[PDB]
Ligand binder design. Structure first.
Ligand SMILES: Nc1ncnc2c1ncn2[C@@H]1O[C@H](COP(=O)(O)OP(=O)(O)OP(O)(O)=S)[C@@H](O)[C@H]1O
Ligand SMILES: Nc1ncnc2c1ncn2[C@@H]1O[C@H](COP(=O)(O)OP(=O)(O)O)[C@@H](O)[C@H]1O
Ligand SMILES: [Mg+2]
Lengths: 40, 578, 127, 471, 41, 470, 193
């Protein structure tokens, strides 16, 4: 029903926000790894 | 600028050397007379230029100057009533400046520089404007012509002129950073004008012909092709759509065809009236005329100018219809250019990119949401003139794969003087399903079923015609002969349409619906009479058949009374005759 | 009753793409302003040497006007002329012997032509 | 300007082509004079000029030329022909040089033979109906003033006889249009390309007997004359026609004896230049080249005179799908197609109406121009004839005895139509005679089947009988 | 049926001959382009 | 990044670059001009003096002075992943749905290697397309190439979308019950207009079919080289999925006529002499390299099934494209115009249709013990109904025998109910039940092709599933 | 090379009544067979390979469909040889090319197969060579001819198609080998119009 679809979209956006927040922490380490790998 | 000299002259092709740095598809002034040319091939220090005019009398060594810009059109107020050539030069100005003969090298602005337009601002200083937003409005012939920002111009409004009379050159709007916006802007003809998104073609395009608007409809954003051998009635059909369409603006492109038909349009259309606005019909029609005796290189320019003007008017929220009088002429011009270029053809002389050019031209149509936020749509009806009626010719076969509708003409009906001479078996349309809600809401709740029944009867008649050709028409049973007779009735008094008769020329959707309902009611009553043993030949003598035949000559205003009376007459005739 | 798959996939993909685009922007803005770092002459020396090595014959090297006084050893070794262009920030333009062929080692080009291979490892390291 | 410069150093002579080097100052499309060692001077036109060498097509044959002695000299930058009103009773060859023995024409002007494209705004609507005297033309395929109405012919079909009959009989009907004035006779410009001796003699004798030679400009290109003059001949003839019509208010009727020969010459030139061909080996620009010839006819706003074109072309094997008739039909306004089957029946002129067409018919006929029933009668005749032909096809399967009386009636209409309406011989039928014959023919059918005619016209004219017109 | 078969095969032969002519002309133009590119350099 | 300045010739799609020996043949290059706009290009001929680059897009604005060319990859490569499901692409691997670009697990050449003939195995299990005229009489087996022969106006796209959002496997029929077997649909669109593109997008998203679909949509106004590459990209993704993740992949190619025309134009551009009918002489081999990438592999549980869709140019099967497709593919499904104009959808004509692998995919343990017999009986009965319906026009209803009238009724009800399915999704059991109900109209014992045991088991039912109880 | 060609005076017994009786083919003769879809052409060829008096059977697939070739490759290892009772493949050589394999290989497949057949014949055996489809091979030959830019002749087939077919079919015939031992090669070249 409509309630199920609304719950699905709410939970999808919530877990997307969770993924974004959990990747924010490791962003800097990832950027440092990319920088050290690219530069010869 | 890039300046060179003429190295070799061969018909409409001039090779200029010393043109390093010149860009492909740029405009060049070939010769001392400054003939308009386009660079189509670069080879070292030399450039290959196709001259949009006549090269007779040119001498080797004359200067060639490259303007550094591609072919462009002036888009703005002042086009809605004039006739233009392939490179958008006003033919009235050419006649005034040269006489009854079109002479090469005449330079004249596409938009009149003396006409004053009642400018009316629609923006305020400090406002942020994007491409396609409305800077203001100007009345042209009752059309609220909107002044638009060029699609790739961004900035903030600084100063806007007050309401008054100004020419197209007047910078009515001056943005910050010194950007001046005039009443008109130039656009390259080969770049499709950007849009926000494409919409689904929900509404139909009312051509005013019973067969085209009923059996094979074309939607508002759709594309149609009408191929046929010479004499079938392609151009008369194009003129009929121009006269009786429901499109706000009509762009007629006479690519490489007769000049007499262009004269006929220029003379008849001012007298005819706009079915919706009520004013003269000529006030909504833009003609790009490239007669067959004009230079071949101008045909591609004519097609592109027409479609670009159609796109520009679509950007103003109008509903534009674009009828190309011939695309096979464009293909032949491309073939001549390729022959000059010494290239290997793909099929029957045409260069390999002809299919890509046709696809790009036909894909410019469609209903879109403009960058200004409003709604606009362009419908393209492309006429095809195959050599000898050969529908396997590469132009027709490439058109078959990109059009949403296909109106095939056959020489058999043209010889019989049965017009519009549409080959029902060879025609199709892909918009029937998408237009059903509109037909239900605007015609009747059962219009799709009625049209499907008519198509089924025509299909049955076509299937039985095979046996008719084998055993004759009288060797069939009563039911099959009745089907044949009903198909004949349909063909003779529903699909037929006299494009010159004052009343039969236009036929609204409801009149065609009434005629279809009358014909199908007659079919059901005749089938009931046959099933009970009444002779078919007795049925064929009913004067109500003559009433059905005459139904198409009744005027729109007084049609519904005739429809009700004829339905009552059908019921009474087949109840009395059982 | 099956749109949940599309919804969750779109949400996860949007989060992943936004995170990776932020990685792009942060690494791009960090790699900028290299001459402000005192170790820039060494890395641009490496850039110039690899650029001239890629070309069998080098005519001239074109770089930032302020970066010219840091590329004289290889210029004297190879005879290439130093040319000043403000547009070539943080990069060395290597010109072939005839001038038809030319190599650029701009840092943005480095990142653009490396990210396609890097992304597979970057995604696994990040998540 | 008038000083002579000679370009020697020919480097190639094969077929009709000729290459000359160090001629970079020869304008494109210029006319040159080719002089050989014997002192004879040929003709030539530049078809491709570059800074290296220029290519010149030779009007005459190349026999006797030699690379060591041949000399090429410029005549003028643009091919121009001297035109004047004095040439009304003159003959000329394919290149405008007089062949009647009279002194050369004193040119009032020198106009470019290539012409210029008429401005569509300056054109008028062709509305003046012309009563040719032929029922299949006057009624069903009406020819108006300023129209292009080619006659599609065959190998043995008498197209030349039909054209001569039209030129002898064609006139306007001032009273029917309401003008009520006397009208000057037509001036006939006769262009012949590759014309044989029989055809030329027949035309000369016909124009002598009718007395039109005193007002007919003739450009004659014999069948044995060089085939490159056929390229220039129609352009010169149409230039003279345009000059006369639009500078002296003459009404010019132009007859092009054979466009198939012109197409053959164009194909020869294209193949010599290795131009990319269209269908059947004809050059790609054949459509444009024929358009530049046909589109020179019409009427001009504000000008009294007009140019009416009646081209004659022979379809190779009666193949209407051939490139020549196809392009001509695409360019011109309809066609008058002759039928071989009708000719075999002894029906002259053998004009079968079904493939015939006149696009400007509606502008010339109707109420206040010829008669109110003209268009409706034409449509009814076309429909009934097509039904009769279909019934003939049905007879060819099921036999005449199996038909109903309706199909028998339509078949009788069809064969009486062919025997009376089309077949008229050498008589000059007025439009009223043609219309009354058409109504007499339609009277054979039941009155209720005239579904394409309004009841007013039916009541006013239905009822007449064929035997009543002539006994 | 035999007459229609003969007509069909005659039309097929004519079309194939036209296609062969087109291929031959394409070969000629390709060869002549190659030759004129070679000697002119 | 190497940049190859020194363009010396531009004409149409071609441009010549000098001193570019380092460019590998077939490589993709990036053409840049004065304005900074970058175009696409493919190296079609490389030599010591120069290389020939064929430009994807239009060459307007290019010039010999400022044009620059740079290589991107030596061989045409596509980055594939399992996350491609639920995405849309422009036929060259670039997302067009607005979602961020995928993270490629691996990058594979689009010109996939041929399957080893001894590596393959027999197609054995059928695919349920939800269409009665396809499931029952023209069964599609996993690993078959079953083209759909359409016409100019026939609704090929609607049938394609219906099959795409209705196709499924039936593990319960085989007794495996392996719902663990994934299913994916790879859709390749070539030379489609905006209307068809919008229709496909809406149809794929309205029923959630996008969750198991990969869309390679190439518009009609896109460069033709992209049209050529689109089936290669789609088949590479299908092969990767099927043979690296055990997926059962169904591939739909629309429309192969547009692909052949693009191949024709590109071959003509490279100054190649056309073969028969003006098409390239190597069209058969190219179409084979496309089609023969479908099948099943011994030792692997995946499968690739192809449904090419091509429009006959004049409903003519003598045309080179349908001729070669019939040469390469196993059978065909032919759409009928007379059925379509009678209001029947899907307009599939059983008489000209054929499935060459049908006999191996139906029967005991696969669909049902009576499938083949029912299909044969339906074919024969429909042929009899059609010929009797043609005869009744001349001889009348009464003159026919009673069994002839029964065949008339059978043919009419067949066209009304079996073929005229509409927008339903019919499992094979439902279609078989409808077929048995239709055959029940014919007298028992006249059903010669079906054995008496199956007749006793199923004959007798009446028509209520389509009308009266949907 | 062979020592001497022999007259077709002995029968090639296929084991099938209609062919062995009504339309016999000599040991060393050449026969053709057009194969419709369901006409059991594959079953007929299997019976020829299984029951004929030929010692060694050579099967050549020029341009067969992948699944059609796969059927053969899966089913031959299962068929048994009546002469010995073991698998039939122990006297069979398979040359298989699908439509996606290189065109030159598909064109040279029949030559490779017939050369192997002639080699086996030179050992004194009787060999039955079976081209699975000569129309596919002719299509490959036409493709190669077009790639070489030769005149299309009739229907695109190169003008030397008849010459190549004659050269292929003349390799069949009962001969006396260079070693003085009798052998024969029989060709059944299927055609698919
Ligand atoms: N001699 C035979 N005796 C009995 N059944 C046969 C015989 N030949 C063929 N069949 C039947 O034919 C079917 C298998 O052969 P087919 O599939 O028709 O051969 P095929 O498909 O024509 O082979 P191709 O054309 O090379 S793909 C089975 O139903 C067999 O029972
Ligand atoms: N709908 C129509 N109704 C009546 N006459 C028509 C109609 N269409 C065409 N005709 C007739 O056919 C002639 C040829 O039509 P036209 O359109 O000029 O040729 P084409 O097919 O090249 O466009 C017209 O001049 C007119 O007499
Ligand atoms: Mg027209």
């Amino acid at each position: 029903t409509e309630a199920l679809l609304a719950r699905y979209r709410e939970r999808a956006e919530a877990e997307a926000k969770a993924v974004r927040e959990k990747a924010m922490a490791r962003l800097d380490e990832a950027v440092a790894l990319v920088l050290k790998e690219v530069l010869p | 600028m890039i300046q060179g000299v003429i190295q070799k002259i061969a018909g409409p092709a001039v090779i200029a050397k010393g043109m390093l740095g010149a860009r492909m598809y740029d405009i060049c002034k070939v010769g001392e007379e400054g003939l308009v040319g386009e660079i189509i091939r670069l080879d070292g220090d030399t450039a290959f230029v196709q001259v949009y005019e006549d090269t007779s009398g040119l001498k080797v060594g004359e200067p060639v100057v490259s303007t550094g810009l591609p072919l462009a059109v002036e888009l703005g107020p002042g086009m809605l009533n004039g006739i233009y050539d392939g490179i958008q030069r006003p033919l009235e100005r050419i006649r005034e400046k040269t006489g009854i003969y079109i002479t090469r090298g005449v330079v004249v602005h596409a938009l009149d520089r003396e006409k004053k337009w009642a400018w009316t601002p629609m923006v305020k200083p400090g406002d942020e404007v994007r491409g396609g937003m409305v800077l203001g409005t100007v009345p042209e012939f009752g059309f609220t012509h909107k002044i638009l920002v060029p699609p790739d111009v961004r900035g903030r409004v600084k100063e806007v002129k007050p309401a008054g009379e100004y020419t197209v050159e007047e910078p009515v709007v001056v943005l910050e950073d010194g950007t001046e916006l005039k009443m008109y802007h130039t656009w390259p003809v080969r770049r499709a004008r950007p849009v926000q998104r494409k919409l689904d073609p929900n509404t139909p395009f009312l051509t005013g012909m019973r067969i085209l608007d009923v059996l094979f409809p074309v939607a508002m954003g759709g594309t149609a092709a009408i191929p046929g051998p010479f004499g079938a009635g392609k151009s008369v059909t194009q003129q009929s759509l121009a006269k009786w369409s429901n499109a706000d603006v009509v762009v007629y492109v006479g690519c490489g065809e007769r000049g007499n038909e262009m004269t006929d349009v220029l003379v008849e259309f001012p007298e005819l009236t706009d079915p919706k606005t009520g004013g003269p019909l000529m006030h909504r029609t833009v003609l790009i005329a490239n007669t067959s005796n004009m230079p071949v290189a101008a045909r591609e320019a004519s097609i592109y100018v027409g479609v670009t003007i159609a796109e520009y008017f679509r950007d103003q929220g109008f509903s534009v219809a674009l009828m190309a009088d011939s695309t096979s002429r464009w293909a032949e011009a491309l073939r001549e250019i390729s022959s000059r270029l010494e290239e290997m053809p793909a099929e029957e002389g045409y260069p390999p990119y002809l299919a890509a050019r046709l696809a790009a031209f036909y894909e410019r149509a469609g209903k879109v949401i403009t960058l200004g936020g409003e709604e606009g749509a362009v419908t393209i009806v492309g006429a095809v003139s195959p050599p000898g009626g050969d529908m396997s010719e590469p132009v027709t076969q490439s058109t078959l794969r990109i059009v949403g509708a296909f109106w095939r003409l056959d020489a058999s009906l043209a010889f019989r003087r049965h017009f519009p001479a549409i080959n029902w078996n060879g025609s199709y349309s892909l918009f029937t399903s998408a237009l059903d809600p509109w037909y239900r809401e605007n015609v009747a709740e059962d219009y799709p079923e009625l049209r499907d029944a008519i198509s089924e009867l025509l299909q049955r008649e076509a299937g039985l015609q095979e046996i008719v050709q084998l055993v004759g028409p009288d060797a069939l049973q009563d039911a099959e002969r009745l089907v044949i007779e009903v198909g004949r009735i349909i063909r003779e008094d529903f699909l037929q349409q006299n494009a010159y008769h004052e009343v039969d020329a236009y036929c609204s959707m409801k009149k065609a619906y009434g005629i279809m309902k009358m014909i199908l009611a007659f079919y059901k009553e005749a089938e009931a009479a046959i099933k009970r043993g009444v002779s078919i030949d007795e049925i064929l003598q009913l004067p109500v058949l003559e009433r059905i035949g005459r139904a198409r000559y009744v005027s729109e205003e007084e049609f519904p009374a005739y429809f009700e009376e004829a339905m009552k007459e059908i019921q009474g005739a087949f109840k009395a005759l059982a | 009753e099956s749109a949940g798959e599309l919804l969750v996939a779109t949400a996860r993909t949007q989060a992943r793409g936004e995170v990776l685009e932020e990685v792009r922007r942060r690494v791009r803005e960090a790699l900028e302003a290299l001459p402000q770092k005192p170790e820039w002459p060494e890395v641009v020396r490496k850039l110039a040497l690899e650029a001239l090595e890629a070309l069998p014959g080098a005519k001239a090297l074109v770089a930032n006007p302020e970066d010219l006084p840091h590329l004289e050893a290889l210029a004297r070794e190879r005879g290439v002329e130093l040319q000043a262009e403000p547009a070539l920030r943080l990069g060395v333009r290597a010109v072939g012997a005839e001038g038809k062929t030319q190599v650029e080692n701009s840092l943005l080009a480095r990142l653009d032509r490396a990210w396609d291979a890097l992304s597979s490892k970057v995604a696994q390291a990040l998540w | 300007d008038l000083l002579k410069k000679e370009y020697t150093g020919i480097t190639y002579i094969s077929g009709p082509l000729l290459f000359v080097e160090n001629a970079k100052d020869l304008a494109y499309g210029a006319i040159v004079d080719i002089k050989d060692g014997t002192g004879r001077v040929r003709g030539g036109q530049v078809i491709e000029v570059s800074e290296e060498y220029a290519v010149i097509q030779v009007f005459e044959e190349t026999t006797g030329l030699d690379l060591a002695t041949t000399s090429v000299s410029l005549v003028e930058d643009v091919a121009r022909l001297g035109v004047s009103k004095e040439m009304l009773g003159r003959r000329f060859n394919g290149i405008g040089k007089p062949i009647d023995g009279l002194p050369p024409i004193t040119p009032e002007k020198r106009l470019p033979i290539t012409g210029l494209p008429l401005n569509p705004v300056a054109r008028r609507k062709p509305e003046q109906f012309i009563q040719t005297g032929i029922s299949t033309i006057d009624v069903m395929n009406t020819l108006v003033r300023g129209q292009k109405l080619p006659i599609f012919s065959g190998s043995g079909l008498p197209a030349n006889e039909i054209a001569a009959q039209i030129a002898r009989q064609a006139t306007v009907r001032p009273d029917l249009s309401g003008e009520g004035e006397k009208e000057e006779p037509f001036a006939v410009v006769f262009a012949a390309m590759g014309i044989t001796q029989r055809e030329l003699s027949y035309f000369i004798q016909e124009f002598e007997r009718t007395g039109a030679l005193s007002r007919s400009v003739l450009f004659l290109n014999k069948a044995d004359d060089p085939t490159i003059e056929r390229i220039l001949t129609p352009r010169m003839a149409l230039t003279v026609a345009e000059y006369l019509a639009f500078e002296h208010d003459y009404h010019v009727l132009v007859i092009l004896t054979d466009m198939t020969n012109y197409c053959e010459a164009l194909r020869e030139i294209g193949a010599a230049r290795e131009e990319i061909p269209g269908r059947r080996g004809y050059p790609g620009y054949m459509y444009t080249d024929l358009a530049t010839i046909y589109e020179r006819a019409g009427v001009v706003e504000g000008k009294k005179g007009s140019v009416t074109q009646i081209p004659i072309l022979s379809m190779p094997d009666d193949d209407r799908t051939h490139p020549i008739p196809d392009l001509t039909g695409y360019i011109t306004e309809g066609q008058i197609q002759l039928s071989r089957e009708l000719h075999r029946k002894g029906i002259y002129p053998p004009i079968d109406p079904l493939p015939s067409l006149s696009r400007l018919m509606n502008n010339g006929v109707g109420k206040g121009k010829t008669r109110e029933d003209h268009k409706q009668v034409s449509d009814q005749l076309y429909s009934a004839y097509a039904n009769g032909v279909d019934i003939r096809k049905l007879v060819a399967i099921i036999g005449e005895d199996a038909l109903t009386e309706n199909d028998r009636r339509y078949l009788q209409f069809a064969d009486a139509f062919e025997r009376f309406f089309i077949n008229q011989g050498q008589q000059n039928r007025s439009i009223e005679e043609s219309l009354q014959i058409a109504w007499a023919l339609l009277s054979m059918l039941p009155q209720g089947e005239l579904k394409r005619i309004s009841k007013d016209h039916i009541g006013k004219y239905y009822g007449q009988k064929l035997e009543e017109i002539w006994g | 049926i035999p007459g229609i078969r003969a007509q069909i095969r005659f039309i097929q032969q004519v079309l194939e001959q036209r296609e062969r002519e087109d291929t031959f002309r394409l070969k000629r133009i390709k060869g002549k382009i190659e030759a004129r590119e070679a000697e002119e350099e």
